[PDB]
């Protein structure tokens, strides 16, 4: 690489709010806590929960005996 024009590039140690630690080399300036990470995520665990696209026979027959 060129020796001056690039900024710093430090290994910083983030901790997800779910708890997982990650030692990654980047250029933030501080160890920053993300809210969600790729572990204990909705879609990476399988928690996407697609809506029932019309349960109108369940709705009606729930409403009326």
């Amino acid at each position: 690489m060129k020796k001056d024009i690039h900024p710093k590039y430090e290994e910083i140690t983030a901790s997800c709010s779910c708890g997982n630690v990650m030692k990654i080399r980047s250029t933030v300036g501080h160890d920053l806590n993300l809210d969600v990470c790729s572990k204990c995520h909705p879609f990476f665990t399988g928690k996407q929960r697609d809506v029932a696209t019309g349960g109108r026979v369940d709705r009606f027959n729930k409403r009326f005996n």
Partner: protein, 177 residues
């Protein structure tokens, strides 16, 4: 980095026991990752260009190169030799660092991830994804706010098919609707 090690164990063993292989040079490896930032408004104002270059230096690792317009078209009112876009190419160690940063910390924040497309592939092993907004990379202070300024990433593997590069990216624990 560590996903280079995870590649050299798990991904290469899964691609060995996925396709019929003799040699370890059949199995593809990702050569490079290229960021593009297609600014296009540098014919109007000029400081947006170097601030978008600063955003690419913030998101990626190294400094972006300002690319020039090759063919001049009046339909976008552009001229030969104008600084019209920006690009970074990361290969090797910094590519593996950016790849683990894309997987681990970036795509979790992509604002209603309903599963990104899998028909995106090229025909010779290239993925291409265009983020609508650059916030999802956490390296921004957010206190600076300029514009939207989204970018796009093009990953180039030496795979031949799209089965090949698609299963190779799926070996890297990729979401893939």
């Amino acid at each position: 980095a560590k996903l280079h090690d995870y590649y050299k164990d798990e991904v290469v063993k899964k691609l060995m026991t996925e396709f019929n292989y003799n040699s370890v040079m059949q199995v593809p490896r990702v050569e490079k990752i290229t960021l593009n930032m297609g600014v296009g408004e540098a014919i109007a104002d000029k400081k947006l260009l170097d601030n978008a270059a600063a955003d690419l230096a913030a998101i990626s690792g190294q400094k972006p190169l300002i690319t020039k317009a090759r063919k001049s078209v009046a339909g976008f009112k552009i001229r030969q030799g104008y600084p019209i876009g920006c690009k970074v190419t990361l290969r090797g160690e910094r590519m593996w660092e950016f790849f683990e940063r894309l997987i681990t910390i970036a795509v979790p924040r992509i604002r209603d991830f309903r599963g990104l497309s899998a028909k995106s592939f090229d025909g010779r092993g290239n993925y291409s994804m265009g983020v609508r907004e650059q916030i999802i990379f956490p390296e921004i202070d957010y206190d600076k706010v300029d514009r939207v300024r989204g970018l796009d990433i093009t990953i180039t593997t030496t795979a031949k098919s799209d089965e090949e590069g698609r299963a190779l990216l799926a070996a890297f624990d990729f979401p893939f609707r």
